[PDB]
Amino acid sequence: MNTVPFTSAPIEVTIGIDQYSFNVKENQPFHGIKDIPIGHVHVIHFQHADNSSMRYGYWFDCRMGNFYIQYDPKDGLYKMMEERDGAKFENIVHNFKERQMMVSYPKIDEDDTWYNLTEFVQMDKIRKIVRKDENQFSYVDSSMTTVQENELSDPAHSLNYTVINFKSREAIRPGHEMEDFLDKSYYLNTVMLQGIFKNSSNYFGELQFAFLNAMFFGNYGSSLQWHAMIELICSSATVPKHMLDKLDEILYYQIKTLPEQYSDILLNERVWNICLYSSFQKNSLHNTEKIMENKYPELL
Amino acid sequence: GAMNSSNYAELFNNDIKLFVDDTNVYRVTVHKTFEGNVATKAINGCIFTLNPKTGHLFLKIIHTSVWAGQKRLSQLAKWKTAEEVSALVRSLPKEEQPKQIIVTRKAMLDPLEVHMLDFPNIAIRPTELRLPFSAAMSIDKLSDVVMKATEPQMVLFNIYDDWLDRISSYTAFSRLTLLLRALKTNEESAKMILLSDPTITIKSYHLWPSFTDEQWITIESQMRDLILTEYGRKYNV
Numbered sequence: 001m002n003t004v005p006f007t008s009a010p011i012e013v014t015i016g017i018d019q020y021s022f023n024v025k026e027n028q029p030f031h032g033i034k035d036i037p038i039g040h041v042h043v044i045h046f047q048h049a050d051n052s053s054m055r056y057g058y059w060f061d062c063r064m065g066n067f068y069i070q071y072d073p074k075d076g077l078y079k080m081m082e083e084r085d086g087a088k089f090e091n092i093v094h095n096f097k098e099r100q101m102m103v104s105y106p107k108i109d110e111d112d113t114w115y116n117l118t119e120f121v122q123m124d125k126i127r128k129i130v131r132k133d134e135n136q137f138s139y140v141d142s143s144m145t146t147v148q149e150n151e152l153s154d155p156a157h158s159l160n161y162t163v164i165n166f167k168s169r170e171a172i173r174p175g176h177e178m179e180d181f182l183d184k185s186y187y188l189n190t191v192m193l194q195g196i197f198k199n200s201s202n203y204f205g206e207l208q209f210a211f212l213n214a215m216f217f218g219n220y221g222s223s224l225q226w227h228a229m230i231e232l233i234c235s236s237a238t239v240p241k242h243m244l245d246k247l248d249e250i251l252y253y254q255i256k257t258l259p260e261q262y263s264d265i266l267l268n269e270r271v272w273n274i275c276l277y278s279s280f281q282k283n284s285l286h287n288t289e290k291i292m293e294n295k296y297p298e299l300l
Numbered sequence: 301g302a303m304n305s306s307n308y309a310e311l312f313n314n315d316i317k318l319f320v321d322d323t324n325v326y327r328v329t330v331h332k333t334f335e336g337n338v339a340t341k342a343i344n345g346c347i348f349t350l351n352p353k354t355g356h357l358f359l360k361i362i363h364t365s366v367w368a369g370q371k372r373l374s375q376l377a378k379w380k381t382a383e384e385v386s387a388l389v390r391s392l393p394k395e396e397q398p399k400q401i402i403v404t405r406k407a408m409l410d411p412l413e414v415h416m417l418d419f420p421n422i423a424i425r426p427t428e429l430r431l432p433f434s435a436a437m438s439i440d441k442l443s444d445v446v447m448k449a450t451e452p453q454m455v456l457f458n459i460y461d462d463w464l465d466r467i468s469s470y471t472a473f474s475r476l477t478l479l480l481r482a483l484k485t486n487e488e489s490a491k492m493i494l495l496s497d498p499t500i501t502i503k504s505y506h507l508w509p510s511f512t513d514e515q516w517i518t519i520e521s522q523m524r525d526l527i528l529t530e531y532g533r534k535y536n537v
């Protein structure tokens with residue numbers, strides 16, 4: 001079990017760790033988060049009390065280093081940093097635990113939610129979508145635009161998701177115009193899976209990361225990417241059976257975790273109705289269709 | 301964006317553009333089978349691709365053999381239309397290729413966009429005007445060449461005959477649309493008006509009769525009456 005200590009909490013802020021969150025008051029004696037499960041990526045995120053504009057946060061993996069948070073009064077935000085001196089870090093943490101100034105990652109033992117939302121998400125892949133090679137952790141916020149959004153403006157602060165465009169020469173083989181547009185299997189299986197992602201695990205990892213950035217930061221380009229990656233699978237007539245079964249599980253847990261009150265903005269009516277009721281895979285997503293119908297029947 | 305009643309005058313500027321109408325590509329007769337079920341029989345069709353500035357018509361005849369053994373023909377028809385329009389553009393010299401293609405039905409947008417990916421600078425546009433190009437098969441010489449085709453064929457016409465020698469493309473298009481709007485509403489009466497007077501003939505190299513300027517005014521007016529007449533017969537006004 002790993003720990004992310006905080007130097008201090010000088011401004012009132014709502015702090016998230018994965019799907020959990022808690023409020024810290026201005027100058028409250030808060031010194032971090034303990035008992036964080038090893039084996040998963042994690043995200044620690046922030047919304048200031050005085051300006052809910054800009055949710056921001058950091059993706060990290062405690063196996064890759066010792067990380068802590070410190071407020072910067074000049075740039076006005078909570079920054080993640082790496083401590084290289086390992087005995088300095090252990091001594092800081094042990095002292096903060098002895099004084100019980102830390103919240104405990106509050107995982108229920110029965111509960112596999114976070115695993116199920118991050119099953120295929122890897123830090124190494126995150127660091128290629130979010131490019132800042134001098135850090136082992138990755139900053140994301142509400143406002144960051146994607147490479148594709150920038151094509152349709154600061155490239156260093158962009159989310160470099162894989163570009164998917166159904167009316168593109170990459171998507172459409174010369175001479176198979178109708179075939180490839182109406183059945184996207186060659187774009188899914190040859191162009192994207194064999195060519196770009198190499199395997200379905202990496203495809204699912206980017207899909208899951210895009211969903212999480214949409215949900216935790218309200219990042220609009222991430223929501224676009226999540227729906228595009230769902231739509232590319234649902235609009236393919238030929239999909240490996242193992243990917244369909246896994247996709248159904250992935251989406252089930254995403255829809256289950258989505259705040260009931262954010263559905264209006266994080267779910268695209270067209271994509272979901274097409275995917276569940278019109279597409280080739282309209283009958284292959286039983287778990288996802290059942291939770292959607294019981295939880296969001298208005299959208300449909 | 302969409303061409304409408306606000307910006308329809310762009311039709312008569314000097315940027316090359318084509319209208320594409322697909323309403324006569326897939327044509328069928330519906331009939332009963334010996335068992336009393338219903339079946340369709342396709343007949344030859346055509347793509348109606350028109351330069352509104354010059355009158356040049358690229359009539360691509362769609363022979364019934366293109367449908368043999370194919371499913372979902374109404375959907376295929378849109379993709380075949382887009383395939384043939386893309387082939388036409390590629391066949392034209394660069395300086396004759398259009399800058400814009402306006403489709404008369406919005407269901408042609410995605411098929412044509414996908415077939416024209418190699419031409420990113422050619423704009424594919426819809427239109428909000430409910431135009432009458434479906435009535436092109438009421439022009440006897442166009443219907444005749446479509447029905448007689450025994451294989452795929454492209455036939456070139458000028459749908460304005462020699463009118464541009466005397467009137468502007470705006471006025472010529474106005475004359476063509478009025479004629480087509482009337483053949484579509486009452487074909488029998490429309491053709492009666494056009495041929496009633498045996499002394500006015502259609503030249504071998506033309507589609508419409510050789511009316512003087514003053515006779516076109518009379519013809520135009522008789523077409524304005526027919527449309528209105530039928531409008532009253534229909535709605536009881």
Ligand SMILES: COc1cc(NC(=O)CCl)cc(OC)c1
Pocket residue numbers: 308311429431470471473474477478479481
């Ligand atoms: C609606 O598209 C049009 C229609 C007309 N005129 C008529 O339809 C007279 Cl029945 C003329 C025109 O551009 C000259 C554009």
